[PDB]
């Protein structure tokens, strides 16, 4: 309460670095306690985003992202049940050049976080967290739900990629902390997008005619998203990310010749 | 051979970024093939380090580190069996300011890589890679070997920490790629140092008198290394590393009161 609200302030000070690990771990514990009131924790994070300073606002977004990724699932479930989330579409801090330059990334980051919650609301699970493989959701999903879902992943992916940063813009610790989290979400979201496409291909011959047409349209849009993903991971390579963590994309884009099973 | 030697050159071009993932994956496969001659692969990497340019030299070091971490164990085994490794103690590239500033990090990085090989030679396993826990090497090791080993970890740790970089010096993609690998080694080396201390404490009352004195000296030096580690991880926090990857140090430094079981 007061201990919750004070930690939120400590994670969002004016200092030019991402939120400290010590404050983040306390918040994460907060989400795991049945007696903590989630909505009050969320609301203190929204209030910080009405601040006029870019640093405060960006750190509040980053703390929110970190809780969505490492926190108990009850946090993202609450976020997804609201009707309005971040409204920072017109944010502009003009107090200094850094301000002007960071304002754009704030707009774009906040839109990604909104879309992450909206996707949870739509399908009732977190694409980043579910079982992968052959025994896992994305892969073992009936043809109806699949056709429904894949387009939601694609939308979340597009918002993630519109962050559109270049290596030479990663110049302070606040934006770099954002990027590292975005990187983690990007790799897991790709894994799930890929798994879904694998299911599609598996089932794309045994299916109705109009289905196979929705199908085709997804594979279609997946191949252009593949290209964008590769540009994103190349920023990651330029910045110095351990090449062991970067996933190998040499996988599933040759079969565009079912654009004729519409025999 | 020629395909091996050409990839080594591609990983070590003059471009200001770490070695590309595509070249690194090929080399890693090279280490896993029984027919590849390891010594010739190693020697091409040493030759690149006689180049006059800081960029070539740093990338050759980074490629070497990456192979020691992700490659087959036969690579580090060969490195450890030589008598001389890197000799870059006097390296200085004066062609430009970046040169002067990067030369120091090259000296320090190359010393760390030498000590990593020498430690493998001394104990016949990689501290970074062995089973952790309660069923694992560091932990289930007789009192004699333990007293022998812990001081080797400490030495490798010290060399790692002498890299001594600050956040504001991480300004290009070559040094940042080095740092990310150093970060990975640091966290695993700490885990193993910690596990060893846990074993010590476990066995430090049931042991001979002179033993308990060597013992005491290690715990002694571990507590000051704890402090240095914490400064290192704080650079990592400043730069923006995902706080989920940074380990929690709130663990094993209160018992300095066996400095009296020398009753
Ligand atoms: O003393 P003062 O109040 O001038 O500053 C505090 C002090 O420097 C601590 O060392 C910080 O904790 P850590 O050493 O950075 O954990 C602490 O951060 P936080 O606890 O206020 O974030 C600082 O507030
Ligand atoms: O054509 P040119 O010879 O001017 O340059 C090559 C070209 O730009 C490729 O796209 C690069 O591969 P990637 O697209 O960076 O894989 C390749 O890198 P590498 O294969 O020489 O490293 C470049 O050499």
Q: Do residues A158 and A119 lie in contact, with contact meaning Cβ atoms separated by under 8 Å?
A: no
Report how far Cα B142 is from the mean position of its chain's Cα atoms: 25
After which residues does chain A become discontinuous at a C–N distance over 2.5 Å?
A: none
Cα atoms in the 13 Å half-sphere on the side-chain side of A7: 20
Check if B1 contacts A (Cβ < 8 Å): no
* Residue B249 CB burial class (10 angstroms; 0-12, 13-18, ≥19): middle
For residue A248, the 8-state DSSP code is P
Q: Cα of B231 to ligand 1 centre, how many Å?
A: 14
Give helix B173-203 / helix A211-239 axis angle, nearest 10°: 80
Is the CB of A20 inside a 6 Å radius of any atom of ligand 1?
Answer: yes
Q: Can you tell me whether residue B39 is helix, strand or coil?
A: helix
Q: Cα of B235 to ligand 1 centre, how many Å?
A: 16
Resolution attained, angstroms: 2.0
Domains of chain B: 1-124 (1.25.40.90), 142-263 (1.20.58.150)
Quickly list H helices, chain B.
2-11, 21-32, 38-48, 54-70, 73-81, 97-123, 143-161, 173-203, 211-239
Q: How many angstroms separate the CA atoms of B28 and B25, rounded?
A: 5
Q: Do residues B177 and B62 lie in contact, with contact meaning Cβ atoms separated by under 8 Å?
A: yes
Residues A26, A29, A31: CA angle, nearest 5 degrees:
115
Q: How many angstroms separate the CA atoms of A188 and A190, rounded?
A: 5
Q: Do residues A226 and A249 lie in contact, with contact meaning Cβ atoms separated by under 8 Å?
A: yes
Among candidates B66, B70, B242 on the partner chain, residue whose Cβ is nearest the Cβ of A181: B242
* Both structure tokens of A214: 């929705």
Q: Can you tell me whether residue A109 is helix, strand or coil?
A: helix
Contacts of A25 in chain B (CB under 8 A): 243, 248
Ligand with minimal distance to A238 CA: 2
Ligand with minimal distance to A9 CA: 1
Which residue, among B21, B182, B248, B249, would best test binding to A if mutated, counting the most A CBs under 10 Å from its CB?
A: B21
Spatial CA neighbour of A91 closest among A123, A51, A121: A51
* Both structure tokens of A107: 């707009």
Q: Cα of B30 to ligand 2 centre, how many Å?
A: 21
**DSSP per position, A166-196:** -GGG--SHHHHHHHHHHHHHHHHHHHHHHHH
Q: In sequence order, which residues have a C-beta less than 8 Å from that of residue A14 and are 6 or more positions away?
A: A53, A55, A56
Residues B256, B261, B263: CA angle, nearest 5 degrees:
140
Q: Do residues B27 and B7 lie in contact, with contact meaning Cβ atoms separated by under 8 Å?
A: yes
**DSSP per position, B175-211:** HHHHHHHHHHHHHHHHHHHHHHHHHHHHHSSSS-TTH
Closest CA to ligand 2's atom 18: B10
Q: How many angstroms separate the CA atoms of B74 and B31, rounded?
A: 7
State which residue of chain A sits closest to B174, comparing Cα positions: A240
Q: Do residues A36 and A4 lie in contact, with contact meaning Cβ atoms separated by under 8 Å?
A: yes
Q: Do residues B256 and B219 lie in contact, with contact meaning Cβ atoms separated by under 8 Å?
A: yes
Q: Can you tell me whether residue B67 is helix, strand or coil?
A: helix
Residue A247 CB: number of other CB atoms within 10 A? 14
Q: Cα of B164 to ligand 2 centre, how many Å?
A: 34
Which residue, among B243, B245, B247, B251, would best test binding to A if mutated, counting the most A CBs under 10 Å from its CB?
A: B243
Contacts of B184 in chain A (CB under 8 A): 242
* Both structure tokens of A239: 């910045």
């Amino acid at each position: 309460g007061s201990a919750v609200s004070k930690t939120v302030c400590k994670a969002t000070t004016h200092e030019i670095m991402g939120p400290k690990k010590k404050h983040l771990d306390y918040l994460i514990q907060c989400t795991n306690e049945m007696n903590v009131n989630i909505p009050q924790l969320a609301d203190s994070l929204f209030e910080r985003t009405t601040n006029s300073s870019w640093v405060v606002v960006f750190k509040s977004l980053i703390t929110t992202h970190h809780l969505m990724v490492y926190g108990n699932e009850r946090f993202i479930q609450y976020l997804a049940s609201r009707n309005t989330l971040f409204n920072l579409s017109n944010f502009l801090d003009k107090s200094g050049l850094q301000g002007y330059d960071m304002s754009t990334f704030i707009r774009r980051y906040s839109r990604y976080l909104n879309e992450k919650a909206v996707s949870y609301r739509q399908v009732a699970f977190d694409f980043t967290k579910v079982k992968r493989g052959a025994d896992g959701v994305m892969r073992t999903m009936n043809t109806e739900k699949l056709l429904k879902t894949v387009p939601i992943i694609q939308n979340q992916m597009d918002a993630l990629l519109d962050f559109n940063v270049n290596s030479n813009e990663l110049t302070n610790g606040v934006i770099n902390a954002a990027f590292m989290l975005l990187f983690k979400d990007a790799i897991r979201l790709f894994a799930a997008y890929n798994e879904g496409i694998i299911n599609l291909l598996e089932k794309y011959f045994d299916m109705k005619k109009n289905q196979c047409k929705e199908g085709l349209d997804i594979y279609k849009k997946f191949l252009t998203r593949m290209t964008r993903i590769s540009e994103f991971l190349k920023v990651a390579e330029q910045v110095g990310i351990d090449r062991g963590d970067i996933p190998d994309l040499s996988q599933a884009p040759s079969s565009l010749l079912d654009a004729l099973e519409q025999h």
